[PDB]
Design goal:
Binds strongly to viral nucleic acids and promote their aggregation. Also destabilizes the nucleic acids duplexes via highly structured zinc-binding motifs. By secondary structure, the protein is an all-alpha fold. The chain is built from 6 helices and no strands.
Length: about 120
């Protein structure tokens, strides 16, 4: 696991007075992502602390479309779909370059929330 319970609680406390998709909210997550190198599963656990189910749903719909858009546009570096999805491949330790791309898309998808 990328974060201990205390670190999840700390990220949560720092962004509780911030709107999802706002500058400070995104920047706090960007910093936490850079420091801990989370997998899609660590990020899914983090979402339970920071986002309401309505926001998780909107975020995951936005992220799914972004992965599909990046794949159709050929913008992913080192992505072979024959070895599985970006989500599945980002879960493996040695796959840091794919994981780093997932993390960026996961982060940008918070800006693109229907409001």
């Amino acid at each position: 696991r990328a974060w201990a319970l205390r670190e999840l609680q700390d990220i949560k406390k720092e962004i509780e007075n911030k709107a999802p998709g706002s500058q400070v909210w995104i920047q706090t997550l960007r910093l936490a992502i850079l420091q801990a190198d989370p997998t899609p599963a660590d990020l899914e656990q983090l979402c339970q602390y920071i986002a309401s189910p309505v926001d998780q749903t909107a975020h995951m719909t936005s992220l799914t479309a972004a992965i599909a858009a990046a794949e159709a546009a050929n913008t992913l570096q080192g992505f072979n779909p024959q070895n599985g999805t970006l989500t599945q491949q980002s879960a493996q330790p040695n796959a840091g370059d794919l994981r780093s791309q997932y993390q960026n898309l996961w982060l940008q998808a918070w800006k693109n929330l229907p409001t």
